[PDB]
Structure formats: C-alpha cells, structure tokens
Design a protein around this ligand. Structure first.
Ligand SMILES: CC(C)(C)OC(=O)N1CCC(COc2cc(C(=O)O)ccc2-c2nn(C(=O)c3c(Cl)cccc3C(F)(F)F)c3ccc(Cl)cc23)CC1
Lengths: 257, 262
C-alpha cells in the first residue's frame, strides 16, 4: 500500500496547488524577502492603510475585508474537498456537514502560512498588515485578530510545507466525529487512508522530526478551540453592530454550530 | 530501542495497577455480568444504598445536591491517585517543581474524565470501587442544572469506549496527557516535551502489538484529546453557573477549602 499512499499524497498535493492560488512556498518567498519583484506594501497605521488602497470606520472596513476573503477561502476549500477520493460519493447531507464544520479549522490552518510573528499577508500577497496594527483596532475588533497569530507562531514551528499541508487539510475535512453525520463508517474509512498517507508523508519529508505525526494531530485540539473562541466573538459583534451583515455562505456555516 | 519502549510500557502498566483501586478489566467484569453491585435507579434506592453501602462522604438535604458533592469528593480522591501515578513516570520527578504542579493542575480533569469512561457504559456508572451502580437515566433526571451535568460524561464515555482500549493501553495514554508541554505557565517546556516523545513512541508501539487489526488507532486516540479538552471547558462553564445560581451549596468553610480545586 506504500506506493498507493505515495500516489495518494501526490494526488492531493497536485490538487492543492490547483485549488489555492497563494501557497505557503510563495508566501514564504514574499515574507522572507531578498526579492525586489515580490515585495509587499506594508500597512502599519491609519494613514498607510489609506495609501494601500491607492496602491493595491476603519475597524469595520477591515472586518468586512476579512469576511470577503473568508468567503473566497470557503470556495477554494470546497473545490479542493471535491478532489479528495471518496468525498463526492458520500451522502449529500454529510458532504455539507463535513464542510460546514471543517472550513473554519482549515482557514486558520492555511492563514498561518501567510503569517509571521509581525503580521499577515493580504490581497494574494501584495499587501502585509502588521500584528500590532490589528491588535490596536477599537472595542472588540482588536482582540479578534490576535489569537490567530498566537496559533500561527506555534503551528509554523512545525515547519510544514505545502505537500504536508495538502494531506493534513484533507484529514480535517473527513472527520467522522462531526455533529449530525448520518454515515460515519464511510467517512472514517476515507480518513484512515488519509492518515496513513500523512503518516508516511511526514516520515519521508521530515525523517529527523521525531513524532511529528503525533504533534501535528495534537494541533487539531488548538484549532478546535480557536474556532469556538471566534464564534463567541462573532455573536458579540452581531449584537453590537446591527447595521452590519454577513455573506449567505458564512451565515449558513455558523447556524447551530 | 523497541525493547526499551516495551519496558517503558510495562513500567507504566505496573504502576497504573498499584495507583488505581478499580481497573478497567475489573470494572468491565462487573458491568457486563462476567459479587453483584447495589443498583441506584430512583429516589428510594438511593436512600437505601447510603444506608447499606456506607458512602465515605455522607454528612444539604436535597438529593441532586448530595450526588453532585459526592462527585466532587470522589474527584478529590482521584486527584491524589493521579498525583501518585505521575511520580512513577520516568523523568517526571526530575522536572522543576513548579512545572510538576502546573502539569498536574491542568491534567487531572482530562484524566478524571478518561478514567471515568472505564467505569461507565451506556446505561450507568460504577461507584464505591464497584459496589454500587448508578443508572444513567436516574442521573439524567436530576432537577434544574444537575441533570444536564452528568449526561455529557456518558456521551463522551460511550464514544471513547468504542476504541476498546485496555489498562495497558490506558497506562501510557494517561502519561501522555500529563506531559503536555502546552500548559500555561510552564517554565521549562523542553524536558516535558522530550518525555512525551518517549511516551508517544511507547503508546504507538503498544497499540500496534496489542491491536494489530485496529488501523490508525494511535491517530484516533490522539483525536480524542480534542474531545477531552472541549468537555473540560464545558465542565468549567457548568460549575460557574452552579456556583452562581445555587444558594443551597452550604458547605463547612473547611470543606469548601478542601474542594476549592474542582
Ligand atoms: C450515591 C452517592 C453516595 C451520593 O454517591 C454519588 O452519587 N456519587 C459518588 C460516586 C460517583 C462519582 O463519580 C466519579 C467517579 C470517579 C472514579 O471513581 O474514578 C471519577 C470521577 C467521578 C465523577 N466526577 N464528575 C465530575 O463532575 C468531575 C469530573 Cl468528571 C472531572 C473533574 C472534576 C469533577 C467534579 F469535581 F466536578 F466532580 C462526575 C460527574 C458525573 C458522574 Cl456520573 C461522575 C463523575 C457518582 C456520584
């Protein structure tokens, strides 16, 4: 099964490149620099934010920018999930349920790729918004961005590359412990294959990184907690800013979550 | 080093037996019918069980409250049992003392829930080292917030027990939980995470030899650490609500002090 696990890993990696326009490899080339052609404009305060629009309330506009980018990410993640062998053959309600509960943990996973300790890439890498600027936004929005950075700094220390992340993201989607699943067994058979592939992938690509398989699964705990914290913060904003709306796609994902 | 992982797994199993009074093998013998426990299924059988089983905690006059405090007394007892087991984990007593205190403080709740599953099935829970059995439906039916306090434990236990782990599996799993290097306030994470790498290596090999047919059981067991963290968080939120709604939690100040941890 070893050669079929390698074939499954190449399949998923190839599909991840096709589905996500900004990879971790591209994001690290922009973040670490040296290059004169990939250099981002940096947003660190109110005035340079206003200059960024000419080149590429404030807290709200940034919030709506995050929602709009999240809708794009849900669309990209949905297109990747279809490529996972077995996913589109599942019962439809379960396809919806796996995506409903899975997209957010994946967005946080992939957002780490665009992050370092000092900020996050934006607008397909043309921009860079600093952590301290986000932390400083008013009333509840300042505390909205920061727990993402806290996760990303820890998660990025695993030094995963895209070919690892492709299998990991798939493992997250095919969780048989999601609420309301009708057919757990066919979902868990798919995940066992993906976990076998991830185990072998991490062993070949990080032969010196002892127990990286176990350490990566333990991060699914930290993802689950940041999603719950996030949802609790949305509930507060939806009750404080009554003149502010959500995309239908995001509205549906959060209903009874 | 294969032989050293097997040695570490046996060491932990031997210590797990000495530290915990009622093993999973023994509890499973009682639950399935394979000596016969007193059964609490309603209000009147509860009143007979205390007069017969001589619970170590009988002094509030209310039924739901007394069961809740009984859960608290047993958890304080279990905390001491877990603390003694942790001392036997190779490397644990050589850690900085504050970090030993920090790992136990944040780990006992996850371990109490994990080991409580061993005493549960879908129909109830064993009590008093297996002399009693309290039905799930009786616990489910307790009034106001207390009925919904007991049921999420059964829900977890039913899923967790579907993994069919035994005591030698659990001895290593419990050690892995104690050695979490991501607890808040740790001073020296490196030696904690080094020990956990050893324990994870032992747990991985144990599950392959003891469950050669259960594919990716290692992965599936680690995925349950997600479910443990989430239920501990909900549990804390339910205590705060009981402490703020229930003026009839009258305990002797000395008793409140004993129980301040849970
Ligand atoms: C009839 C009589 C004499 C009145 O007695 C009782 O009615 N009971 C006493 C005997 C029995 C106690 O059960 C456990 C036995 C053991 C054990 O053996 O290893 C271990 C755990 C419990 C137990 N803990 N726990 C908690 O809530 C809990 C938890 Cl998980 C983690 C951390 C802190 C707490 C705290 F601090 F908050 F409690 C329960 C909630 C629901 C049920 Cl069903 C079990 C637990 C059932 C109650």
């Amino acid at each position: 099964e070893s050669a079929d696990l390698r074939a499954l890993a190449k399949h998923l990696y190839d599909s991840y490149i096709k589905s996500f326009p900004l990879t971790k490899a591209k994001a690290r080339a922009i973040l670490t620099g040296k290059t004169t052609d990939k250099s981002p404009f940096v947003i660190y305060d109110m005035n340079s934010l206003m200059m960024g629009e000419d080149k590429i309330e404030v807290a709200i506009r940034i919030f709506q920018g995050c929602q709009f980018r999240s809708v794009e990410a849900v669309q990209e993640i949905t297109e990747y999930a279809k490529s996972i062998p077995g996913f589109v053959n599942l019962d439809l309600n379960d396809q919806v349920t796996l995506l409903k509960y899975g997209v957010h943990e994946i967005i946080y996973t992939m957002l780490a790729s665009l992050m370092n300790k000092d900020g996050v890439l934006i607008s397909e890498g043309q921009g860079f918004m600093t952590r301290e600027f986000l932390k400083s936004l008013r009333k509840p929005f300042g505390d909205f961005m920061e727990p993402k950075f806290e996760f990303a700094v820890k998660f990025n220390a695993l030094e995963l590359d895209d070919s690892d992340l492709a299998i990991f993201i798939a493992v997250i989607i095919l969780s048989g412990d999601r609420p309301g699943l009708l057919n757990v067994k066919p979902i868990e058979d798919i995940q066992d294959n993906l976990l076998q592939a991830l185990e072998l992938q991490l062993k070949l690509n990080h032969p010196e990184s002892s127990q990286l398989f176990a350490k990566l699964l333990q991060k699914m705990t930290d993802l689950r907690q940041i999603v719950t914290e996030h949802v609790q913060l949305l509930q507060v904003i939806k009750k404080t800013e009554t003149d502010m709306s959500l995309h239908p796609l995001l509205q549906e994902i959060y209903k009874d979550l």
